[PDB]
Ligand binder design. Structure first.
Ligand SMILES: [K+]
Ligand SMILES: [Zn+2]
Ligand SMILES: [Zn+2]
Ligand SMILES: [Zn+2]
Length: 73
């Protein structure tokens, strides 16, 4: 029983992309999902939302590995 996070970022919020696993340049995670995921042990990059955009945790098509954090698995 797996879940999509779906979090929509607030302006100024830090987001996290995994350069090892991202399928496309937009794939990103919210902090909560990132720190509960394999990708905090990978080559990751920080970004700032200007308001909106959304976490891709749970999207099996957005990630080469580790599409779910341990809360959404
Ligand atoms: K996204
Ligand atoms: Zn999330
Ligand atoms: Zn998650
Ligand atoms: Zn990764």
């Amino acid at each position: 029983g797996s879940q999509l996070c779906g979090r929509v970022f607030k302006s100024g919020e830090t987001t996290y992309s995994c350069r090892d696993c991202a399928i496309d340049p937009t794939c990103v995670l919210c902090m909560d999902c990132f720190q509960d995921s394999v990708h905090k042990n990978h080559r990751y990059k920080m970004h700032t939302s200007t308001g909106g955009g959304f976490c891709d945790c749970g999207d099996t098509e957005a990630w080469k590995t580790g599409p779910f954090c341990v809360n959404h698995e």
